[PDB]
DNA sequence: GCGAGTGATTATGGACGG
DNA sequence: CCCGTCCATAATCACTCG
């Protein structure tokens, strides 16, 4: 069984650089070349380079060369990437993969992933605000939301209901609002007859709150 | 030595056959006679999967309705009957000499038009004295993905200080959904009493309105 | 002796032309 | 004749196996 495992999100200001790994196991380290893939926030996939850690051999794609740096530690089957000067455009997944031979010729094993977000802000937790219609339009089910923004950094647990409710629920990518991030969720006659309020938590900000959405 | 793929996004009916287009500026065989051309397929969150390799073949694991085809500069990827489970990403790949990935193909399930159920929301009594205010509009569920959002302040158009957030084609029902938000401040906000928010959608060149005032 | 059999990816050997 | 760039790319090749 194949596997390769990278390392978790990461956090870094302008200029300064990072480094992250990827383990792999279930075959034989040595005799297959490792490859590096980026891919920025809505964009394509995008070759770094390789390695092949059998003899260190390395080759980048020319747009890389000097930003990411390539090493391999044997003993141990881990792969490495290491980012410097990091800027706005350093920020993506960046993925390890596995360049088989044999039995295929291409990347039939690849990792997870590492997320890297590059900024010079601060952690912030988020100001989760309740929002119920202003009844004035032309209605058997209302649609309510909860709106989250002025947080830092991703992402946010948002749910309704401590998780009861999933469908008629449209949670939206969180989109930057200077520095920070904002994101919304909308809810889809058993309201406000009954309870139903949003249930956000943020994890690096180590805190939950919940907003009850009460009419106006 | 680029890889371009076309079309940019490619809208097939369930059932019906779907075909991604892979062109390389110039002809990509090794000089051992493979043409290591690949194929990738990408699902939200997930990591690339493997479909084909060697121009046309099938990875281990990989449904039988993918098949590809080509040499030279011209590469295709064919998905006979697509599944409600095909939607994603398609990119074609280079894996000699300096490798390349294509720009990629994203995969919609075309499927019926629908208009945006909308419904506007008047800034939250605890963000108002807490700085700003912000005013939401929700275009949920509707088909295709193409449309647009205006606000409006007392009948005037508001294009300034918005953001929208859009939601991947929803692998249930097929529709798309977006967001809009107006961050007015606080005492603008209150310098006004109309907010409302129009959406142009295909279906019709009569646009659908929503709309809300401070009372 | 000579015709079938056999390897691969993660770059290069050859043709200009200064 | 040395060397840096550009150039187009199929194992129809080079070579060990019976």
């Known amino acids: 069984e194949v596997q390769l495992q990278q390392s978790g999100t990461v956090l870094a200001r302008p200029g300064a650089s990072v480094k992250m790994s990827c383990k792999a196991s279930g075959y034989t380290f040595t005799n297959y070349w490792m490859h590096w893939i980026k891919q920025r926030p809505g964009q394509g996939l995008e070759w770094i380079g390789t390695i092949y850690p059998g003899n260190s051999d390395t080759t980048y794609s020319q747009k890389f060369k000097g930003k990411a740096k390539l090493t391999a530690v044997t003993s141990t089957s881990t792969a490495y990437m290491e980012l410097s000067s990091l800027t706005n455009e350093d920020s993506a997944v960046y993925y390890c993969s596995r360049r088989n031979y044999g039995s295929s010729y291409a990347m039939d094993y690849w990792g997870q992933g590492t997320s890297v977000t590059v900024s010079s802000a601060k952690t912030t937790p988020p100001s989760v605000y309740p929002l119920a219609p202003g009844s004035a339009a032309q209605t058997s089910m209302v649609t309510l939301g909860c709106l989250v923004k002025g947080y830092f950094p991703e992402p946010v647990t948002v749910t309704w209901n401590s998780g009861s409710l999933s469908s008629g629920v449209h949670t939206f990518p969180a989109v930057l609002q200077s520095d920070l991030y904002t994101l919304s969720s909308s809810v889809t006659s058993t309201w406000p007859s009954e309870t139903v309020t949003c249930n956000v938590a943020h994890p690096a900000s180590s805190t939950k709150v919940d907003k009850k959405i009460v009419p106006r | 030595v680029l890889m371009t793929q076309t079309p940019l996004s490619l809208p097939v009916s369930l059932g019906d056959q779907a075909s991604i287009s892979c062109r390389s500026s110039q002809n990509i065989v090794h000089s051992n006679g493979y043409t290591y051309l690949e194929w990738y397929l990408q699902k939200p969150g997930q990591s690339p999967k493997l479909l084909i390799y060697?121009?046309?073949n099938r990875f281990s694991g990989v449904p039988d309705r993918f098949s590809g085809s080509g040499s030279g500069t011209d590469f295709t990827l064919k998905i006979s009957r697509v599944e409600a489970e095909d939607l994603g990403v398609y990119y074609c790949?280079?894996?000699?000499?300096?490798?390349?990935f294509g720009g990629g193909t994203k995969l919609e399930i075309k499927r019926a038009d629908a208009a945006p159920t909308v419904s506007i929301f008047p800034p939250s009594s605890e963000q108002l004295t807490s700085g700003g205010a912000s005013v939401v509009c929700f275009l949920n569920n509707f088909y295709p993905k193409d449309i647009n959002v205006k606000w409006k302040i007392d009948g005037s158009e508001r294009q300034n200080g918005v953001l929208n957030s859009w939601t991947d084609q929803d692998s249930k029902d097929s529709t798309y959904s977006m967001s809009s938000t107006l961050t007015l401040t606080k005492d603008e906000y209150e310098r006004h009493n109309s907010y409302t928010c129009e959406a142009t959608h295909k279906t019709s060149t009569s646009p659908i309105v929503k709309s809300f005032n401070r009372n």
């Open positions: 790949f280079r894996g000699s000499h300096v490798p390349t």
């Open positions: 060697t121009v046309s």
